[PDB]
Design a protein around this ligand. Structure first.
Ligand SMILES: CC(C)(COP(=O)(O)OP(=O)(O)OC[C@H]1O[C@@H](n2cnc3c(N)ncnc32)[C@H](O)[C@@H]1OP(=O)(O)O)[C@@H](O)C(=O)NCCC(=O)NCCS
Ligand SMILES: Nc1ncnc2c1ncn2[C@@H]1O[C@H](COP(=O)(O)OP(=O)(O)O)[C@@H](O)[C@H]1O
Lengths: 402, 731, 403
């Protein structure tokens, strides 16, 4: 029936957690910034035709509470008929926003929709919103709650991914992200953040460490002594994974996603909706899938979600030019690659969250937009975007260059 | 370059700070700018403090404490207004950098690991008090004239040298905003201590540095671990009233912007809302981040038009007036012994009050003793409120009221050397009233009239000595209104001007000097304002909208409410006068569309508050909602123009009329036009005055004289030719 | 627009009151898990592996309601790990938005079977607990002209000329129709009593109801003085935009505004194939959905444009609709909507509303949708329209047809 097309996909640069450029910037301002960029690119756009704004946000509290999407609509002076809804599907929230938008468009009841996400982790730290799975003992016991870094280490252990293997992926992420930036790949899509006076706040991905070496990564201490892991959680994991004697703690600040601030926005609509606004479609949403796996290991959700979306679209791994999986932890990406036999040169080709960071609610939309660009640059046909999710969920999307 | 205390890091101003290190390792920094009578935050201060703070860091192993002092009569006068007014939007980067540099210096001072004590010898205002807030302890000399506060909001600015950030950490958001920031109030040293802005007081300036050094000595002995550490720089810090994420404050926080909007009445003054935004945003993050946010909001205001308007009016123009710009040149002083006031109505009563409060003997004469007494009762009621509010002692209040003597006998004007007449607007009555008195008063007495419209030249002919006859125009209510409009009639001497000018300062008011003309400056201009409002009512515009337009324009009171306070019968005969003037010269009068509305309300017996009925209904001495019959009478709702058009009609009418007054030589300076319009007839402070409005207009059309003219012409095309700009604004 | 979306089950908990409420002791997660177990009871042979998502509305997703309560519910109820779980917030409409989004996911053809609905324990997690910029951020708060919900409702009354007796007459009418619905057994199959870990009854009725309400009782009530309204400025802010209005008439009280309550709702939404493969009987079809809006200051004008838009897209007119269901946030909102579209009384909120039974923010949308599914079946009628006023001036409307 109706097809869903991507007309614009933009993002902010990503600000680091410690002494970050974006720390002084409210998350709402990040979104408004991007709305003004879309308006700049299409000054003659009839905004009355935009029926919804859908924003992923993992910690909808404080600066990020109170339906931040509606706040963006009003604060940006967008029409009062333009909607505004917040959603939270953990790490995949940004992509889930794009997917929901695509599905609304396909349903025929929405014409032109803005989708994306925002996470300002330096102002609203993860876990700020509370939650029963963690903070209610009865259900914490039930689901066998475990911080995701432990699941990441468990995967490394089971799959036989060594500390060197994991660090080698991290190095390659840094290298590929630096090459993308200096190749001018991100020029069109990364929108510098500016203050109320027009002064520059941030224009690049601060978290990047392009001069990373294998020796430096080997010096880092496991995150098993970091913040999230207090005590008990190894034994909980191993109670389920009872044939595994000992968890090898391989993940560190150097080979896990960076904690960062940022936002992303995507414009999605029907062919008809684009035609009368004079927008050129950049890509088409081919299919979407929600699936999952064991919530204890937590981070193996990408595999069945990917299998499901390929099946829906009637496609196989061989039909996909580019695979983009969020780099929450190196082992998650190596597990995915192993499972589906993904060739290296097809996987996260412009680097990922280890280099550039993972602003929870925005990431899905950011890496989605990253694929729209690479497809256009490479003149390739298909990309598959997927993310691992807390609670053992998986979401995947297939896009096609138009 | 990075984290530097200096403006420049590539390849010079004078030194303004004296360095003295005691045998005990205490450093006194004495501020003494050799280029003015006052210490300001100019390029020389910045470099001088840069050097000193570098030296503080370099010599830290031998410094035990610091004392910040001044060698002037005042402590520190704040930001350099001469530089700030010049800042354009493209200068936002430089302004941001300047203010970040200033604060980097203060932050080093504050986080030095040693006590720093501000020795406040005199006025510490704005940037001045911000230096003191960067210190760990504040001692002020309880001296005459000494003020402390952050008045930058009164100039359309904010405390961008840490003022916001620091007062919020000190008092919390709500108290910092309400008590200090939002209004920018000046405080006497005792009051400044009461609210925690200053820590302790000394009797004389000479005690300051010794007491400061004594404090450091004791602090290091009594509190070694926490010496030179601000409360907010400690691990256990808790912000008074809570942070925005704390439940108690979160519950009331949404009402702060609404309460301010209510207070501002929707006027376009950006400074108070910037201060609030900076306060809350600052409170959400660490000190340094909070401080940088403060700078962005500051640069926002400084490069905006309103700050320019307000800086011009409330610094430059006000200073110009206070230095005697409109006062005649080589004229001496003549101290006033006894004031005589003719008339015990609201005006005369008020004039008698403000004169008595200033310290003068007042003889208050009316036609009967009963009348004169009720006139004095006006002052008694003001003192009753002042005693209840605790703003005066009983003994001083008794003396104030004892200076006022009510009489009905003209012989009681014996020994009176200063006459202020405040009787009914009528020439022959005023002639008669002065007639009865001109021979009883001293031979050198000033003969002053509080006429609103009638030319002073005409009133003067009723007296023998016309050299001493002058217009002394007060505004209701006299106890609150700060302007005196002094009017020179043809026969008025320069000495008379000076003498009244002096009187005006002596009673704590602001003088403008105007050349004689029917309606003068103030009455003529306020007229055009209320006439625009009445015209809209006649055109069919909802009264509710008319009042809202007036308030959202920034006027202290809405125009129909004001039209009730001025009598409608006075407006009628003002129009009758102007009509007679034209018709006698054989011309044809063009009535303002408002005149039909005035006449209509008179015919309905609804001539204003004094008669119990105007555009509003009045019950039991209280105003109570618009008269419901207004809608049927004028077909209200049948005209629905843009609210901004209504606002602009009112503001533009006055701005245009002011230019005419400048053209005709009624006013002699823009300074007088601006301050006179602001203090006399409640023209909105954000505009910086009726004259400044012309050069500093901002809207859809843009900014400046050209953008004003465009909008003026746009209004003329839509509403009438009275909005066409006079030739003096064109090319 | 391909696959048609059908409602197979629509259930809800009773609504517990705010003060000394029966549900205060019950975690919001338990409210949801309870309703999942009811569905399990009703279809013991349902293959849950076919359920691809759970979509829950929640207006204050913090504390007990944070961390994606939907996924918490999926995992805590022992549903398959493949069954999704997503939380969403569109203020008052969140519950309907879940259902709407669920239906739209089915229509896309990428989801087959979805649980949708919502949850709110306002007694445990009060409105506003989540914070938010347009309220708590001065720069935004100024730029959006933020004003509390009640003030908008009072302004509506003022502009349209609804008196205190008018709004209280509707209040009385809601109580009467709620009591009648309960008496007639209209809610028997759909209100699922809440029980503890031991099966003991906690609550089985809508305890906010005041069935013996009188004209005289309502007149004696005081205008709203709790929360945001009691604080200063908001009237003046409102009138600065609505400058032709001289004075707001404060007609709304606790007896003619919706009640603060605890509750949850669940709707089972799927494709025709999905229902057939599982032995499920379709009860209604989702005909169309619309999202629109109006001025954020007056705020509660959103249902009119939303309703007009959904009527239009479904190719329908006011006449074609047998039942109109609009959330009773404030009396004046319902009267305004009725006035705008000339809605006949006998068609409007026929089983009573939130004034009588309460408005558990995130769940209400799903609750009143389920209410209309049951009444359509009971009356043997064909079409219902469900709509809500939303904070920020939004509107959402849905049309269902009995199958
Ligand atoms: C500090 C103050 C009370 C001293 O009053 P005073 O003893 O009568 O001295 P004057 O007012 O005559 O000022 C003397 C000189 O200092 C200058 N000056 C005072 N404050 C200044 C400021 N903030 N910026 C620039 N110049 C200033 C005056 O322009 C004047 O210069 P000039 O005589 O060379 O033209 C008075 O100057 C004042 O109120 N200044 C403004 C303070 C303020 O509100 N600024 C901070 C908020 S931005
Ligand atoms: N009785 C009324 N009903 C609806 N709107 C009204 C009424 N009276 C006045 N208005 C409104 O007044 C407005 C004109 O002023 P407005 O547009 O607010 O000024 P601005 O253009 O400066 O914002 C119109 O948009 C109109 O809607």
């Amino acid at each position: 029936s109706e097809e869903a097309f991507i007309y614009e996909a933009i993002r902010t640069p990503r600000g680091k957690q410690k002494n970050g450029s974006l720390h002084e910037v409210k998350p709402l301002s990040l979104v408004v910034g991007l709305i003004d960029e879309l308006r700049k690119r299409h000054p003659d756009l009839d905004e009355n035709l935009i029926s919804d704004v859908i924003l992923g946000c993992v910690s909808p509290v404080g600066d990020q509470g109170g339906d931040i999407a509606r706040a963006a609509v009003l604060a940006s002076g967008m029409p009062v008929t333009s909607g505004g809804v917040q959603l939270n599907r953990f790490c995949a929230s940004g992509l889930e926003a794009v997917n929901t938008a695509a599905q609304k468009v396909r349903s025929g009841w929405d014409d032109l929709v803005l989708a994306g996400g925002v996470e300002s982790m330096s102002r609203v730290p993860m876990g700020s919103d509370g939650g029963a799975m963690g903070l209610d003992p009865a259900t914490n016991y039930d689901v066998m709650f475990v911080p995701q870094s432990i699941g990441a280490d468990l995967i490394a252990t089971i799959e036989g991914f060594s500390r060197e293997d994991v660090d080698a992926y991290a190095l390659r992420s840094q290298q590929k992200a630096a090459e993308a930036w200096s190749g001018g790949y991100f020029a069109k899509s990364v929108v510098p953040v500016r203050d109320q006076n027009g002064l520059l706040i941030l224009d690049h991905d601060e978290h990047m460490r392009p001069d990373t070496t294998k020796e430096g990564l080997a010096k880092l201490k496991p995150a098993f002594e970091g913040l999230a892991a207090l005590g008990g959680f190894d034994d909980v994991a191993l109670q389920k994974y009872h044939w595994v004697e000992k968890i090898n703690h391989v993940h560190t600040g150097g080979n896990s996603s960076g904690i960062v601030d940022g936002a992303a926005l995507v414009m999605i609509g029907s062919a008809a909706a684009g035609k009368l606004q004079g927008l050129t479609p950049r890509a088409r949403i081919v299919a979407t899938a929600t699936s999952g796996a064991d919530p204890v290991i937590m981070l193996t959700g990408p595999t069945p979600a990917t299998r499901k979306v390929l099946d829906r679209a009637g496609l196989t791994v061989d039909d996909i030019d580019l695979f983009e999986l969020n780099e929450a932890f190196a082992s998650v990406v190596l597990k995915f690659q192993k499972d589906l036999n993904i060739p290296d040169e097809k996987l996260n080709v412009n680097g990922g969250a280890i280099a550039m960071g993972h602003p929870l609610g925005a990431t899905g939309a950011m890496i989605l937009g990253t694929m729209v660009d690479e497809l256009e640059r490479r003149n390739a046909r298909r990309a598959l975007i997927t993310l691992c999710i807390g609670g053992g969920m998986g979401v995947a999307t297939i896009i096609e260059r138009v | 370059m990075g984290s530097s205390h200096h403006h420049h890091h590539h390849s010079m101003p004078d030194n303004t700070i004296q360095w003295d290190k005691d045998a005990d390792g205490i450093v006194t920094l004495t501020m003494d700018d050799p280029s003015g009578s006052t210490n300001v935050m100019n390029e020389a201060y910045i470099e001088s403090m840069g050097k000193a703070v570098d030296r503080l860091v370099a010599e830290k192993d031998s410094i035990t404490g610091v004392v910040v002092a001044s060698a002037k009569k005042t402590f520190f006068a704040g930001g350099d207004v001469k530089t700030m007014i010049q800042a354009r939007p493209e200068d936002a980067g430089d302004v941001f950098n300047t203010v970040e540099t200033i604060k980097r210096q203060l932050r080093t001072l504050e986080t030095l690991g040693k006590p720093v004590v501000a020795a406040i010898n005199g006025a510490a205002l704005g940037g001045g008090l911000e230096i003191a807030l960067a210190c760990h302890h504040r001692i002020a000399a309880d001296v005459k004239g000494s003020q402390l506060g952050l008045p930058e909001v009164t100039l359309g600015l904010l405390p961008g040298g840490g003022g916001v950030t620091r007062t919020v950490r000190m008092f919390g958001i709500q108290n910092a905003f309400v008590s200090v920031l939002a209004q920018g109030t000046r405080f006497k040293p005792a009051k400044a201590k009461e609210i925690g802005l200053v820590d302790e007081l000394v009797a004389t300036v000479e005690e300051l540095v010794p007491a400061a050094k004594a404090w450091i000595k004791e602090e290091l002995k009594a509190n070694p671990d926490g010496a030179g550490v601000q409360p907010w720089d400690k691990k256990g810090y808790k912000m008074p009233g809570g942070t925005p994420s704390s439940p108690g404050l979160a519950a009331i926080l949404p009402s702060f912007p609404s309460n301010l909007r209510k207070q501002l009445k929707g006027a376009p003054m950006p400074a108070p809302r910037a201060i609030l935004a900076a306060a809350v945003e600052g409170a959400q993050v660490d000190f340094d981040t909070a401080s940088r946010i403060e700078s962005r909001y500051f640069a926002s205001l400084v490069t905006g038009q309103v700050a320019k308007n307000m800086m011009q009016a409330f610094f430059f123009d006000l200073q110009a007036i206070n230095a005697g710009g409109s006062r005649p040149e080589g004229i001496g002083k003549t101290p006033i012994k006894r004031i005589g006031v003719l008339g015990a109505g609201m005006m005369g009563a008020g004039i008698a009050y403000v004169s008595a409060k200033a310290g003068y003997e007042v003889v208050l004469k009316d036609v009967s003793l009963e009348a004169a007494a009720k006139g004095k009762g006006y002052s008694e009621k003001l003192e009753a409120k002042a005693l209840e509010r605790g703003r005066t002692t009983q003994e001083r209040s008794d003396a104030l009221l004892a200076r006022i003597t009510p009489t009905a006998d003209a012989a009681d004007f014996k020994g009176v050397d200063f006459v202020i007449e405040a009787v009914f607007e009528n020439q022959e009555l005023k002639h008669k009233v002065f007639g009865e008195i001109e021979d009883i008063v001293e031979p050198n007495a000033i003969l002053g009239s509080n006429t609103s419209t009638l030319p002073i030249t005409g009133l003067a002919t009723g007296v023998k000595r016309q050299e001493d006859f002058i217009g002394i125009h007060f505004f209701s209510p006299v106890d609150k209104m700060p302007l005196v409009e002094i009017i020179k009639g043809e026969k008025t001497s320069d000495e008379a001007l000076a003498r009244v000018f002096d009187y005006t300062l002596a009673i704590g008011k602001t003088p403008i000097v105007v050349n004689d003309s029917r309606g003068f400056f103030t009455s003529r201009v306020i007229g055009t304002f209320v006439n625009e409002a009445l015209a809209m009512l006649g055109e069919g515009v909802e009264p509710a909208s008319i009042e809202q337009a007036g308030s959202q324009a920034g006027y202290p009171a809405p125009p129909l409410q004001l039209s009730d306070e001025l009598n409608l019968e006075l407006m009628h005969k003002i129009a009758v006068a102007t009509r007679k003037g034209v018709e006698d010269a054989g011309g044809t009068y063009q009535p303002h569309p408002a005149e039909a509305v005035v006449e209509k309300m008179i015919e309905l017996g609804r001539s204003g508050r004094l008669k119990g009925a105007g555009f509003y209904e009045y019950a039991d001495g209280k105003r109570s909602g618009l008269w419901p019959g207004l809608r049927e009478t004028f077909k209200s709702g049948s005209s629905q123009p843009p609210l901004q058009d209504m606002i602009d009609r009112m503001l533009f009418a006055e701005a245009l009329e002011t230019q005419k007054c400048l053209d005709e030589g009624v006013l002699t300076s823009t300074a007088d036009a601006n301050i006179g319009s602001i203090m006399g007839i409640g023209f909105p402070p954000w505009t910086g005055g009726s004259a400044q409005f012309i050069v500093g207009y901002s809207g859809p059309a843009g900014t400046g004289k050209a953008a004003f003219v465009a909008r003026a012409r746009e209004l003329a095309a839509a509403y009438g030719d009275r909005f066409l700009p006079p030739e003096s604004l064109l090319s």
